[model samples]
Target chain A: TMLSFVTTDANIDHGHLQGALSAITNETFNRITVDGDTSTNDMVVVMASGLAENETLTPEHPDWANFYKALQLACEDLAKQIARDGEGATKLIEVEVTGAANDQEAGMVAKQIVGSDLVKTAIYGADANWGRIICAIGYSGCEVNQETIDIAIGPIVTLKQSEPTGFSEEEATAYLKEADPVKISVNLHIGNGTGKAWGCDLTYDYVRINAGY
Target chain B: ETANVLKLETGSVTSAKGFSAVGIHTGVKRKRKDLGAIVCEVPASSAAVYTLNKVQAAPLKVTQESIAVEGKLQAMIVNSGIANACTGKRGLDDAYTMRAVGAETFHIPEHYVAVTSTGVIGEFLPMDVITNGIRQLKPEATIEGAHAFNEAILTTDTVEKHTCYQTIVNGKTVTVGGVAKGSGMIHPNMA
Candidate 1:
């Protein structure tokens, strides 16, 4: 399938190989939220060629983390490209979720926020609707400590600990209107697990492309 | 950094051994090749996850039933342009008929075939054109046909998405390859 991942390594064994792949994939591709509608045909496969013929690498290996980083970065790059290439999309939106009960929960909450049509349209209009972001978290299907939620768009903090920060609307709107990609970070201040998601703003062109197709 | 094991290669669905594919114009979608097929030399293990949309197209229903009855598939037939969806009973019949025709033309068991459609919803297929189109696909199934198949399966995709990789595992060379088409109706939940 289009989501397959092929890995060919010299000395990797089955012990930690699968575990490493799953973990890295979670941090990278899995974190991406493309409209929150999972494609039916999405598949990810990793193939190990074993051509390198080096010593078997495992979690205990000295360079294990380095190799893991490379794999994660590769998936991250691909996910970023996917967001940038969204049909008729203009800006890429990156969301980071931190301090939730677990990484998976954080990811679910973050994805809900990024995948919301309201949020996407707001991004397209360069509208600073922090309440919409909160609404997404509320309905993420994951339990979040609402009182401790914090959200930031770019470097501007619009909401803190679930309360409106009363930040400058003009500044926030201007920041959103910039040509640079959008970045949103949320902190639950509950646990250590964190997740990230990638998406793009909803544009008129997106509607134009899908309306007839 | 750890030494890389897998490397990318220039190829498509045919990069793997024992597989052939072709793409042909069926007048289904303008001048584009709207009909495509991938044939395996032998029956292969297959698994598919379809869109969750309850309002699925007829081909999805037929393919699911075929796969449920027979765990293996020898070939897959796909068309782009008119998605035979919400067409009711006749649409389902048409899907089965398409499968039967494909199996006969490919000389494979009817139950060991799969079919798919993508495009505008609620339209019936032009069977006269598609039936003839499938027959023409018979002699065109070759390794080089991957590019053609890649082009045929697309709808609004501005650029084709295909990938292939080769590696050595257990002293045997193994290759993984694939092709994809979709630019809209893209939600997380796909059927």
Candidate 2:
């Protein structure tokens, strides 16, 4: 769900595993298991073939623009694939940051969200757990003027006036309508910097995946 | 031919760039076999480097700002054993006064004299020893002079340090040799 840069949920099938694997590679996703539970079949493989035949991507090549975009697509696809296959995961959580002062600050906050257990449980029970989200922000170390905190789950806005604002259940439900992928935005009104974080939901499949499946 | 014979007297091998280099030892500290002065035969260009510790010596701040103004220098007067930090602002002014005195020795711009003080980080330097050191300076920059200069920069180090090399860059061969004491902070980006 995070891979789409928002929260998304879906039932498991065959193709989703490849989707999850694809997501893992595009971004930096290492084994972040707070608990050491990986299945016997749990494997991540990649290969490098050093064949340097390049038509090239640069100012010299007009097609460099197209090649770069395709390369980015390839990376994004791999990252989403891994998030999809996460254990007992219902929604893939992507913590998206926009309007950051610098890349490092944005990355710091997004990584903190991935480390949040409060968010994990909240999403697992479909709880609109804003407090967990807020707590994650507090420790994000990206603190600036608190008056600029803005958060959105797809199109549903939660706490926009530097505090909790008008948030309705119907608006959030409409925004999180994707079954395969989702996106979330945490826009702080500070300097212009941004980052993206990927995570998966909490579920019984996690226990099963932990036990060996 | 313009005949001018000016020699250095004191301790350090390296002298103030524009004028000369001279090292001295006052009895307030133990007499080091190392330390002396180098008086220039002719007024030359001046360049020097210093320690980067936040608690810089009185001499360091004075020399740095003086060098910044004239962009050239002549003589230097320095001593060791006491760091002259935490000795209050007065110690710093004393260092500045040393530069002012060095200006009188070379009869050049006060901004043209460079000063450096090294040793322990915090303590009062012996003023009487420094004041008399100027009268004893001479002009000699030899291998023996190099050893005396090298010893001036020593602290809690187990050994003396050195590097000597000659390299041709851009079709010009320049000689480079250096000595001091160091263990850590070796990432020395000119520190």
Candidate 3:
């Protein structure tokens, strides 16, 4: 059950405000996953008090860009916080997808990687199992060329050009255990599309938390 | 569209001008705060994105109705404990009653109020406790009240989540602030 409320003093019309919020939500909240279960009461609401004394904002307004950026930043920050605090989560996992077919496809791939239970469990155990990551990417329904795929955990490239990099498993495990946010980067070599998604490592406490309640 | 955006050190929902918020315990979640309210001095332009889940909660429908009237809202009341979901007509009725009570407490029209609930599903809200909590709510346009409101929305969340940013818009320092609560059952695909 995710709930959020946003408030701003920027002078903006309802239509413009809604459009900005919807677009930002797609990039932020829509990309994150905890247990891959959407709550019935999940919601995000924004209210503009129009007390900034600026000209009423529209897409054409000069300050509209600043307003939209501020709103997006706020939403993204909250989204990451929610992911970091996932039930029984020990570390936050961020998936960055690059060279996809388009923004939507990039998002799909990034989300799939973060939502994969296998990948999450691997991270929880500090296991450098890059196979689970590539497995998730294969089923992401995005255009990908196996020979052109690259996978990296933090700064250590585990797989390059669809072949194992023969990286040090001990070093990768240490990186995973020390990094509060374990970053997984994937490049498809398909196009210029890019996106990011956030989640947390699956742990025993997660099962305990949801088992009863 | 190059703009300078700066993060603020201290901010919350009440950081925005003309808006105030507060959170208090209503016995819904033992000693933890379970109820909160945010109020604006005037009707504010508003928009919301709801869950795409087919089995939407009653509060979502109630909030949609309030904002649908004029795309504006003056107050929002929320409770954490009983989600007021899957309770059928009683859930809807309770959600509407929450708006009405909040409207009375804040001296605003019922149509200008939005209601939301989160937590255990398939249960009814404790109206008496919630009603009393609404009446006793004292929203302040201060950082303390904002932090309190942030705490009231949490369920399994380990820490309070919020952000505030400032940017120069039309030669004025405009502020955007937000607060959120979620730790499980996320995976949002809002329609």
Candidate 4:
């Protein structure tokens, strides 16, 4: 049956996305992208709301966690699909923020640093540009104290409170050499707030995709 | 086991009294540009978010005050070229000027302007470039035009940074597309 809500991103298979979403009773419609850009051929369309079943998503209901998980899973799935299909993507990246003053703050902090070009290029080159990273977080929208933040890429590490763990540059470079999904741990240490963001490394091809077409 | 990645972003949203935006290039670093901006039109009922960086730039300071004075904001202007932080008062004024420009363009009140910047740190903004960008902006722009805005804010992003669009405002189709570029100076700013 053609469920108008049975749509996926232009690059993903909405049929599968719909089946997976519908399989769960936790309101899959909440998990779809806000701006509808379904392809003529894609089946992942969002449901037109204004239905009685439409209940606002809240964090207090018993099913809230489940609902959030469903949406999170759906987003994670789509994010990975984009990564794999990332225009000329070669590496998958995950951005995390912890110890924010709040979830809202965490989101801003994570997006700010994770989204810097100098930072991305450094990651791509496997260069340990801790200063660049330090600068990014220093200015991220959330509150921050340099002495409290700690970061490590596999083993190449830097700590505002301590030394860079003094890991060997060679060892750090080797860690970057490994084709592991980029994993990061960030703590805002301000309050009970943590968030995760996803993306792939910027490559020449990415430039061609956005810049070329 | 897939090897690609994508990131999702969230801006402080409320039932009303919204935000301002604009993609700007302060020429922060590395000749990289790719930033986005928009000024949310928030009502006088006030609430705000701020950076806690002890070393925060001046723009943050101005933003903190502007939102405070307007009681309700007329608009917010954001850019990606140079973060006007750490420039002291000059940086702060440049930020305010950006708002004035945005306000003049949008015909909004100046004090009602909010400013946010992105890109490299430890530098002064290129007012000329920023001023020119403000002069050249078109209100009838598309989210697709965010590409240049994103390009203007980049310091070294491998690819122009952008995010997927989401959100339904007042039943009118809205886009949440954005562009960003960053690589190393990333961490938790408990500020």
**Candidate 1 wrongly placed segments (more than 4 Å):** A1-86, A91-98, A122-132, A150-185, A192-198, A210-213, B1-9, B138-144, B165-168
lDDT string, candidate 3, A83-202, tens digits: 999999999999999999998999999999999999999999999898999999999988989788999999999999899999999999999999979999999999999999999999
Q: Considering DockQ, where higher is better, how would the candidates rank from best to worst?
A: 3, 1, 4, 2
DockQ for every model comes to: 0.12, 0.01, 0.88, 0.02
Name the TM-score of candidate 1.
Answer: 0.70
Off by over 4 Å in 4: A1-213, B1-36, B39-49, B70-75, B79-81, B119-122, B165-179
What candidate 3 gets wrong by more than 4 Å, as runs, is none
Q: What's the C-alpha lDDT at position B4 in model 3?
A: 92
Q: All candidates' TM-scores? A: 0.70, 0.40, 0.98, 0.44
Please report, in order, the local distance difference test score of every candidate based on alpha carbons. 0.68, 0.47, 0.93, 0.46
Alpha carbon lDDT at B189, candidate 4? 23
2 or 3, greater by DockQ:
3
Residue B132's lDDT within candidate 4 is 70
* Candidate 3 chain A minimal-lDDT segment of 10 residues: A59-68
Order by TM-score, highest first: 3, 1, 4, 2
Q: What is candidate 1's lDDT per residue for B65-156, written digit by digit as tens?
A: 76666455667788878777778898889889889889988999987778877776788889989888887885343446876886777766
